[PDB]
Amino acid sequence: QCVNLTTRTQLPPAYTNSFTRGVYYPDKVFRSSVLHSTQDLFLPFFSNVTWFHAIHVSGTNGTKRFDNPVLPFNDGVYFASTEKSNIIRGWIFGTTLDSKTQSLLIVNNATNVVIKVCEFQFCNDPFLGVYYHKNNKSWMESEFRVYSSANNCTFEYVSQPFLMDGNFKNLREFVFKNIDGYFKIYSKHTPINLVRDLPQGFSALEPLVDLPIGINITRFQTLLALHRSYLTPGDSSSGWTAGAAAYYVGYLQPRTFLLKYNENGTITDAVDCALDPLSETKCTLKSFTVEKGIYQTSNFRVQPTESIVRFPNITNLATVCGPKKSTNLVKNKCVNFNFNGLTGTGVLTESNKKFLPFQQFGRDIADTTDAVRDPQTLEILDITPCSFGGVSVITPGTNTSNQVAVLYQGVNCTEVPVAIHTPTWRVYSTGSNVFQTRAGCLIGAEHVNNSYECDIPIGAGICASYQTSQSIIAYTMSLG
């Protein structure tokens, strides 16, 4: 049956870092001494992971409630758990967690894992009560309290063998995905010591099972082992040393990754092609180490943030133009324009070109329209391609430092993406003190009057170098 526990009271979260964890073998291929580039669902490097304690002893004298909130499941979950007494037992997967929608129960009880995909009537607080005997302390009695009723299953797995029930903490990491009706569970196990949060390190995850589910999952829940008595909750020590066991949750995200396979075919290192400029250059060169110089990584273009339509001020259902509403007109901003059916993108400006009374367009190069006349308010306005360029990454060698500078070629940088609040690194703070050069806008490097035999050639007589504590500077080269 089901037994009610005290209300969760919506405890405020506490967060922690995920230092480069959660890289699993994406495919079923063997590679050796190859640096292979992949794109899939991964946990981003250096991400927020929210961590819950098993039993929150809120009062110093003792509180003995469970922390098992229902959390969203958005295209996969990285779930790590550190414990020393086997306190978490399993997970509940579903969409509504009632009798209306099918649900997966993966909890193990004392005997086996009992993977059960059925229609469960789940209660509010699921758990498995384990009681040490207060006298003999030899038999640990276990009683599940998960589902009131289970009906008409589409799957079942059981395990025949039985499994047995002060700082020897152990770390179990899992990744759950749902692709093409297949529930993929990847797993990994590792001993640890004297690390309360997620330790610094890397660990590839080996696929464990691909379960043919074919249902939807959107929410999931964690089931815990209740050491104490709900009928008679004790004052203290009823739980396991104040809910020491803990579990961390993070959400995957579509990302590319440069993945390093060693000689044995075991993944050992990884690199985010969307974390900071150095990593983008690493992915572009298809190597983990880069030498000093200037590398062109990608291209930058301003996107049109709105659309405008100007249709003639006559009904007539070109004069047979279809039914569409002519919106207002904007200027000095890269927009998508549609003038009398003529579509394009650009920035519009007031034009001084004296149009003759019968002319409509204007073209200087014979394949691009330069100016235009608005059909409703007949004013001449010219069109310019708003912006575009290439992004180069000034860097000294990867031995020296991981500081870089970014140069947008041949563009003003009163319009480079700034003050931002996906790799949204841009600047979002003018603490770099960008400054224009004839070659474009250079962001992240200092200006210095001193002149030296310039090492990294930038352009227009400007070269950059790494100087001593130490950072990047840009200066006009001297000839000696």
């Epitope: 870092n17 230092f19 250096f46 991400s47 927020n48 610094q200 974390l275 900071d276 400029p277 150095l278 991981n402 500081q403 870089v404 500078a405 690194w425 979002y428 703070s429 603490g431 770099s432 962001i443 992240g444 950072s471």
Partner: nanobody
């Protein structure tokens, strides 16, 4: 990262103060956050430093009175000071180095003695 720092002003000798160098970007990818100071008529000098792993360091005249902290609930680095004296009157700044160095505009700390 708009790493603004608030909490400066006038204090009495032997008092305490709190500064709240707070960053919009998550402090998990900062990889280094420090505090420097500039006294009137004297060049800039480091106060304290904390890196991503957890290593903590202070300059010679820093230990025992102010330590550096950071709570992973609102992204911020903390430097609370105890037993302030006259020569600690200076302008303080916090620096963070994600892939390019970021500085804040500092805050003035004056001690009455």
């Amino acid at each position: 990262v708009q790493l603004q720092e608030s909490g400066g002003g006038l204090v009495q000798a032997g008092g305490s103060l709190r500064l709240s160098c707070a960053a919009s970007e998550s402090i998990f990818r900062m990889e280094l956050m420090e505090w420097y100071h500039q006294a009137p008529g004297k060049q800039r000098e480091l106060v304290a430093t904390i890196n991503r792993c957890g290593s903590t360091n202070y300059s010679d005249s820093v230990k025992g009175r102010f330590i550096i902290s950071s709570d992973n609930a609102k992204n911020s680095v903390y430097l609370q000071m105890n037993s302030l004296k006259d020569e600690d009157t200076a302008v303080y700044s916090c620096h963070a180095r994600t892939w390019t160095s970021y500085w804040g505009r500092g805050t003035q700390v004056t001690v009455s003695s």
